[PDB]
Design a binder for this molecule. Structure first.
Ligand SMILES: [Mg+2]
Ligand SMILES: [Mg+2]
Ligand SMILES: [Zn+2]
Ligand SMILES: [Zn+2]
Lengths: 56, 134, 119, 101, 69, 56, 56, 56, 181, 30, 65, 183
DNA sequence: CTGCTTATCGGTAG
DNA sequence: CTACCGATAAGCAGACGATCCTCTCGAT
RNA sequence: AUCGAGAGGA
């Protein structure tokens, strides 16, 4: 549907901003680690999660 | 046309789609370190030796080489040669067990050492049939 | 832990004890040269290190084009020119933090709001 | 979990941290060695308190000095003393031993 | 430029297309000028290299030597 | 790849295809998407043996 | 087992020889020759075995 | 041949053209598809054998 | 070792690109580990790749190449003396390998990659940005990352990745004319 | 107009150019 | 390797149209598209037939004997 | 330019995290075993504890590293000379032996000639310096799959490794109708 | 992404 | 006190791999 | 026909 490609799109688009943010959050020592994992593991894990959910 | 088969306009084959050629060649030389043991192209018969092939020879002229427009097929002898051990041991190449076509061209030459040499091609046209791939 | 070698043999010196007037006593098994203590410091460990964060920071830095560039200020020098990148230690357990190097005062500055730093 | 101890969202924690292996190292920032031969006082400003204070309810000149992170000390169900009495119990009497509170 | 010596004979000039037919080797001759003019082998030639006569060859020249262009 | 700045953990960069097999991928998408199953292709011809030994 | 197996047996005495069936011939051929690999090592062996009937 | 299934008696039907022909719905167990897969046949020789196949 | 290795590269680079040092040779200055590697070895792979230096008067960072050259090079299409190689030498184009790629920034299309920053037909795919101002050589054309066989596929971008790899083993099992003769 | 920059399209000429001068197997000859 | 006589899919002779078509292109300065339409080809099974036939024979006459 | 003689030098950091005192050794061609560096450094003339560390650590605020080498230094003020580093390696018959190996197969590119000893020290410093950058995690593992540190060997180079291999034969079958000529 | 063999160390007996 | 025996720990070495298939090149 | 190397189909 034309206006679905407009929803679809933006839809990825708010996950771009969550990744971003979390990235920014993270870069600021802020982002918190997940019992037993690298805080870097949790940034990865959040993002990958944010975008699978987007695809979805 | 399922589970990736497909269905083909047999009329259009007929008009030519997807057809091809198909040639193959076969080859031959004379003898090894004989001063007295030298294979010889010929068109055979028996001579005292008599293993000679189950198939037909009658398509080969003396030289021992079919001729061009001849149609061969089946187990036909394409190239007669014999190899004399003490005597006339057939040794001679027939057309593939399965294959049939036509002679296309035949060549005769030779090697570094003055050696006899021969290469026969056969040609066949193959048409889109049932089981073929695409 | 900054230590020190003999003058006289450029080797390595070591340590004993001012028993006697209680103090410290470094010293070569190269000559017999000797020294009074730098500092009592004598061995450092660190297991959690900040000594590799900045790393190769180098006038040339500013031209290397693989280096991305940000919009900040450096705080001494006022410009908008920098160039940043994550901490160079290549530990697994490390801060996803940034570091900038300004371009006109080769000033180095940080992305981080919690941790305090001098480098 | 134990049977009624089913959701002490808390009783899980203990267990955690009842189980969850855990070295000095994990918490230890940096480990150092000064010659501070002078028991009764330090060479280092930062230690001075820590000196009025060890006697309320021999020794060598060579001080081993571990620093601890603020962190692992929160992340872990964690205590100096704990550390300490750990350190002290390993060794009993063969090392002498103190901290900041 | 590649040649070839048929037994009982001259040295032929060698042509890719020819060797392909008679099982010969498009290879060329190996000469060293050894001190106190001399050959020691041949050396298979990379067709369309610096020796392969087809390296300088025109289109029309090819077909001529029967060689696909 | 080298069309990208360094120390970049953003999406694009990190193999996030965003378009569809329909509108289509871009260069990087393609190439990434190519590491895709090479991994795939690979283990496949690797499952395939681990497997048939089991089975024996 | 006393009758079927015995350490001395375990070491060699006298070595069977396998008849043709197990290892024949021919070739391109006829009048020239020839053979599998036991026939050839089945020499190496009756080989050095005559070098030693010729010292002794 | 991983299952019993990859084996199995049929019922013959001669026909023109040169491909073994089969029913789709006997596909899985063999796990064929038809962009190429090739397949073998065997033929029993004993009146039992035959039984063995048609029965079991 | 070398102090002022900057003033050196430059020089290096003008010299391979003038033609006085071979164009093979690779020429990598890591800034930040303070090595400078020069490699002439043989067997290394390498390529495209065209060039960018800011090398502009009337504004910003550009490609050196130009409708000028391109258009004389075409020149040489209908005359069927401007050859690729002369591009090489007049420095529009350089050869890169692997190692050296590490220290550049390549741009993709060069277009819509460096004309300044100023609607979207919704069916075009989605490109990212421009984010980068550094470029030093811009890709010749992306399609070449492909090789002889895929280069033949109608559209493989709209296309799942291993499939394309299968057609590429098949393409070589196609029938047709292998040679005029 | 000579100076002016390029566009996409235009790169195919440049490719063209390479290829005429090296062909498909350079690598082996070279 | 020569134009075909008759289009595969459909039926129609075409083979008699090859030279005519290189002639409208080459000479009355026309787009294949027109040409085509102008030689009568209207279905694209049939268009297809010509817009491709690719005349490799022109090159194998190039070899001699 | 000049053979295929293959010649693998390694610098292993014996010792795991914490495991006692992290000593460094290395390895060499026709050899018995390994060698603490310090020696070998002694052996190329480099002798003073520290006129070495320069060869390796390049700046002097890097205690960390320094220290990291502190226990190597120790494995040798069991050897405070040039001729007894040469030593360590099986007298006059076997010192030769080693002033060889450290020209003839200990880092051959560089050179095999006489005097080109510090040329290598230095390198072996290098090595070592990346060998510690990498164990102090300020730098990353070396990637084995960068196209960049691989080559292809095309036809050239290969025609080429036979050509030398047979040109080597005609070459010396001939050092033989020749031995048997006398005339 | 080990089962076997060898070497070293802590224990028991003379 | 010293010697011998037993147990434990560490280091070094060994054999397998999809099924079935067609074909091509070359050699004592 | 043995024997060894690569290529290809599922
Ligand atoms: Mg299938
Ligand atoms: Mg299929
Ligand atoms: Zn001294
Ligand atoms: Zn039609």
């Amino acid at each position: 549907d034309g206006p679905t490609m407009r929803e679809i799109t933006e839809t990825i688009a708010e996950a771009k901003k969550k990744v971003l943010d979390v990235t920014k959050e993270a870069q600021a020592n802020l982002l918190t680690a997940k019992h037993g994992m690298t805080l870097r593991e949790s940034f990865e894990d959040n993002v990958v999660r944010f975008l699978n959910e987007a695809r979805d | 046309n399922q589970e990736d088969s497909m269905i083909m306009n047999q009329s259009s084959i007929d008009r030519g789609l997807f057809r091809s050629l198909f040639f193959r060649s076969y080859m031959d030389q004379e003898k090894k370190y004989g001063m007295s043991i030298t294979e010889t192209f010929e068109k055979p018969q028996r001579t005292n030796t008599l293993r000679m092939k189950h198939g037909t020879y009658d398509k080969l002229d003396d030289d021992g080489l079919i001729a061009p427009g001849v149609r061969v097929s089946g187990e036909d002898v394409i190239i007669g040669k014999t190899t004399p051990i003490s005597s006339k041991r057939d040794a001679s190449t027939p057309l593939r067990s399965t294959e049939n076509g036509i002679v296309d061209q035949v060549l005769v030459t030779t090697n570094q050492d003055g050696l006899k040499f021969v290469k026969v091609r056969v040609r066949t046209t193959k048409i889109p049939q049932i089981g073929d791939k695409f | 832990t900054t230590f020190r070698f003999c003058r006289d043999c450029n080797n390595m010196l070591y340590p004993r004890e001012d028993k006697e007037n209680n103090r410290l006593l470094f010293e070569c098994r190269t000559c017999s040269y000797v020294e009074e203590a730098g500092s009592p410091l004598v061995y450092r460990h660190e297991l959690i290190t900040n000594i590799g964060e900045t790393a190769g920071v180098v006038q040339d830095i500013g031209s290397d084009p693989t280096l991305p560039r940000s919009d900040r200020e450096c705080p001494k020098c006022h410009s908008r020119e920098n160039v940043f990148f994550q901490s160079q230690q290549r530990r697994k357990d490390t801060s996803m933090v940034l570091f900038f190097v300004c371009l006109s005062c080769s000033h180095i500055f940080t992305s981080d709001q919690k941790n305090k730093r001098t480098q | 979990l134990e049977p009624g101890h089913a959701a002490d969202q808390e009783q899980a924690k203990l267990i955690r941290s009842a189980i969850e292996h855990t070295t000095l190292k994990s918490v230890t920032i940096a480990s150092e060695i000064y010659y501070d031969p002078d028991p009764r006082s330090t060479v280092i400003p930062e230690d001075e308190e820590i000196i009025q204070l060890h006697f309320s309810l021999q020794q060598s000149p060579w001080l081993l000095r571990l620093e601890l992170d603020r962190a692992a000390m929160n992340d872990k169900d964690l205590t100096m003393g704990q550390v300490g009495e750990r350190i002290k119990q390993t060794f009993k009497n063969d090392l002498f031993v103190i901290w900041s509170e | 430029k590649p040649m070839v010596n048929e037994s009982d004979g001259v040295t032929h000039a060698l042509y890719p297309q020819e060797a392909r037919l008679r099982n010969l080797t498009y290879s060329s001759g190996l000469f060293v000028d050894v001190k106190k003019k001399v050959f020691i082998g041949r050396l298979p030639i990379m067709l369309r290299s610096k020796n392969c006569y087809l390296s300088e060859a025109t289109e029309s020249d090819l077909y001529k030597l029967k060689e696909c262009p | 790849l080298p069309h990208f700045s360094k120390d970049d953990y953003s999406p694009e960069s990190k193999g996030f295809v965003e378009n569809s097999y329909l509108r289509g991928l871009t260069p990087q998408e393609f190439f990434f998407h190519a590491m895709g199953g090479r991994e795939g292709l690979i283990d496949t011809a690797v499952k395939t043996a681990e497997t048939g030994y089991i089975q024996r | 087992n006393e009758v079927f197996s015995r350490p001395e047996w375990m070491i060699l005495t006298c070595l069977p020889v396998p008849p043709p069936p197990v290892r024949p011939s021919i070739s391109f051929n006829e009048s020239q020759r020839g053979e599998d690999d036991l026939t050839f090592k089945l020499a190496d062996i009756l080989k050095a075995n005559i070098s030693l009937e010729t010292l002794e | 041949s991983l299952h019993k299934m990859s084996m199995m008696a049929h019922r013959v039907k001669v026909i023109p053209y040169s491909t073994f022909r089969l029913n789709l719905s006997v596909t899985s167990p063999y796990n064929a598809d038809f962009d190429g897969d090739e397949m073998n046949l065997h033929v029993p020789q004993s009146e039992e054998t035959r039984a063995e196949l048609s029965q079991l | 070792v070398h102090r002022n290795p900057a003033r050196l590269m430059e020089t290096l680079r003008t010299l391979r690109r003038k033609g006085d040092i071979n164009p093979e040779v690779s020429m990598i200055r890591d800034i930040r580990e303070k090595e400078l590697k020069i490699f002439t070895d043989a067997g290394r792979v390498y390529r495209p790749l065209f060039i960018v230096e800011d090398d502009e008067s009337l504004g910003h960072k550009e490609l050196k190449v130009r409708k000028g050259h391109i258009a004389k090079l075409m020149a040489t299409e209908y005359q069927d003396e401007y050859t690729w190689s002369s591009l090489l030498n007049e420095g529009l184009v350089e050869y890169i390998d692997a190692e050296e790629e590490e220290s550049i920034l390549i741009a993709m299309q060069p277009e819509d990659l460096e004309p300044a920053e100023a609607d979207v037909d919704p069916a075009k795919r989605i490109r990212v940005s421009h984010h980068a101002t550094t470029f030093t050589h811009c890709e010749i054309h992306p399609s070449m990352i492909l090789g002889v066989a895929a280069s033949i596929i109608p559209f493989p971008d709209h296309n799942q990745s291993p499939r394309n790899t299968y057609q590429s083993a098949m393409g070589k099992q196609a029938m047709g004319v292998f040679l005029t003769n | 107009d000579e100076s002016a920059p390029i566009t996409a399209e235009d790169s195919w000429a440049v490719i063209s150019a390479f290829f005429r001068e090296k062909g498909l197997v350079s690598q082996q000859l070279d | 390797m020569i134009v075909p006589v008759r289009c595969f899919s459909c039926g129609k002779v075409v083979g008699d149209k090859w030279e005519s078509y290189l002639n409208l292109l080459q000479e009355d300065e026309l787009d294949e598209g027109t040409a085509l339409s102008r030689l009568g080809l209207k279905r694209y099974c049939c268009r297809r037939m010509i817009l491709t036939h690719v005349d490799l024979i022109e090159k194998f006459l190039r070899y001699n004997p | 330019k000049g053979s295929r003689f293959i010649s693998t030098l390694q610098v292993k950091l014996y010792g795991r995290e914490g495991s006692s005192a992290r000593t460094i050794k290395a390895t060499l061609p026709y050899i018995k075993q390994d060698i603490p560096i310090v020696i070998i450094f002694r052996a190329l003339g480099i002798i003073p504890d520290g006129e070495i560390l320069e060869h390796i650590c390049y700046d002097v605020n890097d205690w960390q590293m320094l220290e990291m080498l502190k226990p190597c230094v120790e494995d040798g003020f069991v050897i405070q000379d040039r001729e007894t580093a040469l030593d360590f390696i099986g007298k006059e018959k076997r010192i030769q032996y080693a002033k060889d190996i450290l020209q003839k197969e200990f880092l051959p590119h560089i050179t095999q000639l006489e005097g080109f000893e510090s040329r290598k020290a230095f390198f072996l410093g290098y090595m070592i310096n990346r060998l510690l950058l990498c164990a102090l995690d300020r730098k990353d593992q070396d990637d084995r799959d960068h196209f960049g540190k691989k080559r292809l060997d095309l036809a050239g180079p290969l025609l080429a490794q036979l050509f030398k291999t047979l040109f080597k034969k005609l070459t010396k079958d001939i050092f033989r109708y020749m031995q048997r000529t006398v005339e």
